[PDB]
PDB file of C-alpha atoms and ligand atoms in Angstrom:
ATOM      1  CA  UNK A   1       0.000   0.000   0.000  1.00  0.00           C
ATOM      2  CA  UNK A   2       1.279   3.350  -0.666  1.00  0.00           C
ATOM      3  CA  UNK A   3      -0.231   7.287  -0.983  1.00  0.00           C
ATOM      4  CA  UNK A   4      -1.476   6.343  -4.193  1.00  0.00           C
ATOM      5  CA  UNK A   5      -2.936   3.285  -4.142  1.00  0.00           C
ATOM      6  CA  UNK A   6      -4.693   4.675  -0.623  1.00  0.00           C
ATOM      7  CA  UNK A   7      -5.721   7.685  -2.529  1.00  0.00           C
ATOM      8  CA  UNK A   8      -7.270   5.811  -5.450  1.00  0.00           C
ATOM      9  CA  UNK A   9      -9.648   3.909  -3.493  1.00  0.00           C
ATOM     10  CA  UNK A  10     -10.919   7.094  -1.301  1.00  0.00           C
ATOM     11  CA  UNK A  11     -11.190   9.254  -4.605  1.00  0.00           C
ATOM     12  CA  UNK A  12     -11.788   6.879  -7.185  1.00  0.00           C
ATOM     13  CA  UNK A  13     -10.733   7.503 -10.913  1.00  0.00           C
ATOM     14  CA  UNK A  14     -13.562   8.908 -13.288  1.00  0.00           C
ATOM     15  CA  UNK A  15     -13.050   9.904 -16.727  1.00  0.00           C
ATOM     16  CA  UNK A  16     -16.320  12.353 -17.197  1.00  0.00           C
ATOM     17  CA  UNK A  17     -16.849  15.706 -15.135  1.00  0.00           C
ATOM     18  CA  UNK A  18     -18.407  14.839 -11.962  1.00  0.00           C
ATOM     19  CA  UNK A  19     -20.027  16.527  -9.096  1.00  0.00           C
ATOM     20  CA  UNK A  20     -17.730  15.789  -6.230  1.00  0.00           C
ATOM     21  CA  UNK A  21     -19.671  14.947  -2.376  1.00  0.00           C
ATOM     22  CA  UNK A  22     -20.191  18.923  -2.208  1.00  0.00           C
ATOM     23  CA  UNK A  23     -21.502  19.570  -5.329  1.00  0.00           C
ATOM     24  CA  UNK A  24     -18.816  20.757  -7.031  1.00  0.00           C
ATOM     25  CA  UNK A  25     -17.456  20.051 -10.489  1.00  0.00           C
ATOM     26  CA  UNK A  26     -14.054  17.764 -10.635  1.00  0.00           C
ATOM     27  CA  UNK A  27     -12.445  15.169 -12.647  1.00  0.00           C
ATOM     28  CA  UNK A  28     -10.043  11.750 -12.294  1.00  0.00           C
ATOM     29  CA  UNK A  29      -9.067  11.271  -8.684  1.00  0.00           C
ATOM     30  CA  UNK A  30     -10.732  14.051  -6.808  1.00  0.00           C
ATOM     31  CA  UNK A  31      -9.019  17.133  -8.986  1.00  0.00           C
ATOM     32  CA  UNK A  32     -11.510  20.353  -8.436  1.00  0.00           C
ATOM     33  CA  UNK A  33     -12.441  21.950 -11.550  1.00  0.00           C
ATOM     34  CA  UNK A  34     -14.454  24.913 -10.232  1.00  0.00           C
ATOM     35  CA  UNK A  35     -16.644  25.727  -7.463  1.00  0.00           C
ATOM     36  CA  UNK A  36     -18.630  28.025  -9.968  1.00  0.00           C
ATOM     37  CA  UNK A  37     -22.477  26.335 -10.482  1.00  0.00           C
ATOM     38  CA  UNK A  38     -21.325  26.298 -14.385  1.00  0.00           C
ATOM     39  CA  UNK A  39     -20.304  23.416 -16.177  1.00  0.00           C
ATOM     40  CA  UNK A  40     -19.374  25.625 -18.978  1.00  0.00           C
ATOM     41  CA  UNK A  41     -16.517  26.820 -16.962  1.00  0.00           C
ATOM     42  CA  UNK A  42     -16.017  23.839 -15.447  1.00  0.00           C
ATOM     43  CA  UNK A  43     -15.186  22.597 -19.368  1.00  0.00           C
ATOM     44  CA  UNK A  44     -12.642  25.502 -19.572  1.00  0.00           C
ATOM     45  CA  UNK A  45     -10.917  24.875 -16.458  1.00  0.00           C
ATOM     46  CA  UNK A  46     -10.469  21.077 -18.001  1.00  0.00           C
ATOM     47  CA  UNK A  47      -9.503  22.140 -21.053  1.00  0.00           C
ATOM     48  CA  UNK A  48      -7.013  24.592 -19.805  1.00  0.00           C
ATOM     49  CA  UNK A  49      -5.526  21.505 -17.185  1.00  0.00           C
ATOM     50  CA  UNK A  50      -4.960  19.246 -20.049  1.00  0.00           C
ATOM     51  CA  UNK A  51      -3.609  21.134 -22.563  1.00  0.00           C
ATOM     52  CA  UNK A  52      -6.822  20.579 -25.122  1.00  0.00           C
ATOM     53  CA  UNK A  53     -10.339  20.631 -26.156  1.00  0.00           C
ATOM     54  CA  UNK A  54     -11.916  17.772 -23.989  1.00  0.00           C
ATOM     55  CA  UNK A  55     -15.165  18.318 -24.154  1.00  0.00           C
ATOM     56  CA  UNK A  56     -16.146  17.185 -20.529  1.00  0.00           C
ATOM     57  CA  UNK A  57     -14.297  14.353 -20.902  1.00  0.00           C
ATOM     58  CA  UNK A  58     -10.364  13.057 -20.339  1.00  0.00           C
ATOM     59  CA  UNK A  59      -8.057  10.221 -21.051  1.00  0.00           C
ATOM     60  CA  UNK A  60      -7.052   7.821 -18.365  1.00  0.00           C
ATOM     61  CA  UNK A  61      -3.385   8.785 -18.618  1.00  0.00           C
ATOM     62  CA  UNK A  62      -4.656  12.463 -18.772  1.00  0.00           C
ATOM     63  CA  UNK A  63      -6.721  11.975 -14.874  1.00  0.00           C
ATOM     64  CA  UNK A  64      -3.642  10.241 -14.122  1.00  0.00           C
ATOM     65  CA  UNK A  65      -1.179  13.155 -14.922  1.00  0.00           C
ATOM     66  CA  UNK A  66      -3.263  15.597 -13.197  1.00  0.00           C
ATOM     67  CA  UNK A  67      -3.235  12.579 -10.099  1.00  0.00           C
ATOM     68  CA  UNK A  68       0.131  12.702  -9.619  1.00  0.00           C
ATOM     69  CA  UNK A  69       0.925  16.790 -10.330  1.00  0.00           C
ATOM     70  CA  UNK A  70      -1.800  16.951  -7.132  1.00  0.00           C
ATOM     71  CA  UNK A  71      -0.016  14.510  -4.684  1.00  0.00           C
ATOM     72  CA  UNK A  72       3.266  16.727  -5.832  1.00  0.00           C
ATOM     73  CA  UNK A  73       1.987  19.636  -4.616  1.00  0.00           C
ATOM     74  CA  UNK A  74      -0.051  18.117  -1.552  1.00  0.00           C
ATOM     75  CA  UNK A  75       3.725  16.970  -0.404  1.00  0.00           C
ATOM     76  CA  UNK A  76       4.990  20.270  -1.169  1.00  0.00           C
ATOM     77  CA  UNK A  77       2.301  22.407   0.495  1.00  0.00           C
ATOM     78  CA  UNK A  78       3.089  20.251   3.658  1.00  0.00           C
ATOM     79  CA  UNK A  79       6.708  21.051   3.534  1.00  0.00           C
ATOM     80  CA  UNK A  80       5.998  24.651   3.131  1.00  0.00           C
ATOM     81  CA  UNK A  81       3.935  24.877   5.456  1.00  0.00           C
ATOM     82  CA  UNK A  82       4.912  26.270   8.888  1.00  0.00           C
ATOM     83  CA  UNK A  83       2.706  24.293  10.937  1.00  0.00           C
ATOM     84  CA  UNK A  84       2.175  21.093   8.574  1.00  0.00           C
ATOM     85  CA  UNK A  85       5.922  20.470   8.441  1.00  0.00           C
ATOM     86  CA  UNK A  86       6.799  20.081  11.426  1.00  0.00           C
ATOM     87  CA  UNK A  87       4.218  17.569  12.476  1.00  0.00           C
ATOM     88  CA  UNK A  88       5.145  15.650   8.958  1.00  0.00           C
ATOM     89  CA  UNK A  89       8.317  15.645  10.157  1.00  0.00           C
ATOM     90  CA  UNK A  90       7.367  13.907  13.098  1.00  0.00           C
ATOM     91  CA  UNK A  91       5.761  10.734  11.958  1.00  0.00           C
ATOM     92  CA  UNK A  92       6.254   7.338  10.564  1.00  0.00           C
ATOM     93  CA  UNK A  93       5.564   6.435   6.831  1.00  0.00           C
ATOM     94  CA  UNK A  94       2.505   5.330   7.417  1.00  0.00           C
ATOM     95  CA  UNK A  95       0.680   8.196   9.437  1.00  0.00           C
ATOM     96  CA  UNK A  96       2.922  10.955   6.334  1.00  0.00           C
ATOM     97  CA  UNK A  97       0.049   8.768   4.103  1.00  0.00           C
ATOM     98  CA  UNK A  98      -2.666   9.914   6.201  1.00  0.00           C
ATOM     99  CA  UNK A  99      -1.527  13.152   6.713  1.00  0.00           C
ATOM    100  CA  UNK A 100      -1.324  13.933   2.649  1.00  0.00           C
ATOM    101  CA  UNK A 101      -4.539  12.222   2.365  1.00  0.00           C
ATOM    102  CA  UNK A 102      -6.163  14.583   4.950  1.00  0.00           C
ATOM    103  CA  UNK A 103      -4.442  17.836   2.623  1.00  0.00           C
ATOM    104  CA  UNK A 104      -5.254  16.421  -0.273  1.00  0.00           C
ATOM    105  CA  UNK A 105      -8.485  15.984   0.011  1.00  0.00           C
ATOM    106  CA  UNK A 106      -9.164  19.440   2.061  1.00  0.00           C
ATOM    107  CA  UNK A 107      -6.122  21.833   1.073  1.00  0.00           C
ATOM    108  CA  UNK A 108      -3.641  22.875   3.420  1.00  0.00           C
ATOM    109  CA  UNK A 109      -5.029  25.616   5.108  1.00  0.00           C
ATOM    110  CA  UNK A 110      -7.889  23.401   6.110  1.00  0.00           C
ATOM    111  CA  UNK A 111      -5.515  20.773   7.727  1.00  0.00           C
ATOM    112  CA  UNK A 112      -3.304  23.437   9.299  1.00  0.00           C
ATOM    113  CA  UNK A 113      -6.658  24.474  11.348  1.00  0.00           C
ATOM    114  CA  UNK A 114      -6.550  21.179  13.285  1.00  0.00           C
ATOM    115  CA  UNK A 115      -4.391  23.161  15.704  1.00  0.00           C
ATOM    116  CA  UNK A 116      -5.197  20.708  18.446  1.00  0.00           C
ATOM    117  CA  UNK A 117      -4.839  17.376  16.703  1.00  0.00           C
ATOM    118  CA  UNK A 118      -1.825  18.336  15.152  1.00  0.00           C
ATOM    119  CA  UNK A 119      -0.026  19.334  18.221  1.00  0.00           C
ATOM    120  CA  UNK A 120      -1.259  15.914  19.626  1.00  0.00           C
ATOM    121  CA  UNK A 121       0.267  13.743  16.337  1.00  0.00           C
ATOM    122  CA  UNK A 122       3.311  15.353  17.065  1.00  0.00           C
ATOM    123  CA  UNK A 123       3.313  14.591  20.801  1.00  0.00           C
ATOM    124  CA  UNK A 124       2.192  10.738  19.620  1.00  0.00           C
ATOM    125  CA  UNK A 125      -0.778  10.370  21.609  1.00  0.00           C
ATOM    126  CA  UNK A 126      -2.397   8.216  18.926  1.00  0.00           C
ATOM    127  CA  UNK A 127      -5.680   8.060  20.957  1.00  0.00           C
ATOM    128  CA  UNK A 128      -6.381  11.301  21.782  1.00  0.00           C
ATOM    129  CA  UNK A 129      -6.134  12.596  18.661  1.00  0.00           C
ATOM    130  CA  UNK A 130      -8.235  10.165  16.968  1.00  0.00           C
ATOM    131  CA  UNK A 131     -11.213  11.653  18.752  1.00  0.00           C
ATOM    132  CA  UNK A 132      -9.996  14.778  18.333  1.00  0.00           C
ATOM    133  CA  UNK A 133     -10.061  14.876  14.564  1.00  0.00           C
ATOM    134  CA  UNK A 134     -13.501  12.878  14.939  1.00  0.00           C
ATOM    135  CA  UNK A 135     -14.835  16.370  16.008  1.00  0.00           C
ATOM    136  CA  UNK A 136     -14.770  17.764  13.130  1.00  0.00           C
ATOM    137  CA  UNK A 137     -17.481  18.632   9.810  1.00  0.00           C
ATOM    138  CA  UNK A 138     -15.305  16.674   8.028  1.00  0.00           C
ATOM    139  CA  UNK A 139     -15.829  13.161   9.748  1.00  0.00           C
ATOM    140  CA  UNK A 140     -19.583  13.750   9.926  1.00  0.00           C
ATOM    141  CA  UNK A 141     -19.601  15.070   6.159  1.00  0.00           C
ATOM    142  CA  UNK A 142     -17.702  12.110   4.922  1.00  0.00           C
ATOM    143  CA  UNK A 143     -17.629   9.585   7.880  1.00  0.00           C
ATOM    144  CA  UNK A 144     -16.271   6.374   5.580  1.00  0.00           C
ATOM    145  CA  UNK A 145     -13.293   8.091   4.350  1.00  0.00           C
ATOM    146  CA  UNK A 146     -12.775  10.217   7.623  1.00  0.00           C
ATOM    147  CA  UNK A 147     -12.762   6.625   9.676  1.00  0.00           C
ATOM    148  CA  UNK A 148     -10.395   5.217   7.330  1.00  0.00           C
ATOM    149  CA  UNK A 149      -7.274   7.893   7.566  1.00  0.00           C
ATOM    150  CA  UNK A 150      -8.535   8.023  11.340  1.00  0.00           C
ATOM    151  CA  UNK A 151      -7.721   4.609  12.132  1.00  0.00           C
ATOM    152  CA  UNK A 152      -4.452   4.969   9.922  1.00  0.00           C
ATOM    153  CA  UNK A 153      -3.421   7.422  12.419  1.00  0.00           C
ATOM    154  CA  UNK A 154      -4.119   5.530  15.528  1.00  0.00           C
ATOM    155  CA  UNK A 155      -2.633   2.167  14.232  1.00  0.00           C
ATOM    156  CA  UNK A 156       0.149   3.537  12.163  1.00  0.00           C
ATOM    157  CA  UNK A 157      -1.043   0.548   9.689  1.00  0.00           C
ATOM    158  CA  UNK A 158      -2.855   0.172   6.394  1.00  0.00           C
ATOM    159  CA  UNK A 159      -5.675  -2.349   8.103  1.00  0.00           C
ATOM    160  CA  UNK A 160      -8.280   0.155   6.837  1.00  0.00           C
ATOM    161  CA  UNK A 161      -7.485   0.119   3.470  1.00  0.00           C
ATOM    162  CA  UNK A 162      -6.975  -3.800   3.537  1.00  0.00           C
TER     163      UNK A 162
HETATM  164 CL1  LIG B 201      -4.095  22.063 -12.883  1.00  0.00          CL
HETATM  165 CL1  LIG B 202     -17.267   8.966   3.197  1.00  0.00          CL
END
């Protein structure tokens, strides 16, 4: 198991615009087109990303390039980021996964405002922060996924994902 293959299976992979669990327009693994109510500019935000005249619609290597240009800069927003580093810094393989899941799927200024479960990932109390982060619009918005990169950070294993 790895960031990508964990990814994958909390994002999926579609190949048409979709609406993603807030309504907004995306594409491949989880990329956000726009948050504009227009599909129209949701096409020109596509075609701009990939370089052509899609038409709604990409390749699979195409949702796969734009995949791996957003775990690239999910990575490097943690690094940069004054409060997300250090705390990266700080953890095993396993639990860096869940933490670039968490950014990836909410940006890094979102993350960074988990002031009080970040502080307790760096001070390794596994349990406490697990509720912590439970407390959140994010677990009760998307409880499935929020469980699964929950548990990854209280077991420091893949078992959710298995
Ligand atoms: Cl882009
Ligand atoms: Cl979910």
């Amino acid at each position: 198991m790895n960031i990508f293959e964990m990814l994958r299976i909390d994002e999926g992979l579609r190949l048409k615009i979709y609406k993603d669990t807030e309504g907004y327009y995306t594409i491949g693994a989880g990329h956000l087109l726009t948050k504009s109510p227009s599909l129209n500019a949701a096409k020109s935000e596509l075609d701009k990303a990939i370089g052509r005249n899609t038409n709604g619609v990409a390749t699979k290597d195409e949702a796969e390039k734009l995949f791996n240009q957003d775990v690239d800069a999910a990575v490097r927003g943690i690094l940069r980021n004054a409060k997300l580093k250090p705390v990266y810094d700080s953890l095993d393989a396993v639990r860096r996964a869940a933490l670039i899941n968490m950014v990836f799927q909410m940006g890094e200024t979102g993350v960074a405002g988990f002031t009080n479960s970040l502080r307790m990932l760096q001070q390794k109390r596994w349990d406490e922060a697990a509720v912590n982060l439970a407390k959140s619009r994010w677990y009760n918005q998307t409880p499935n996924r929020a469980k699964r990169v929950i548990t990854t950070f209280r077991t420091g294993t893949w078992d959710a994902y298995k």
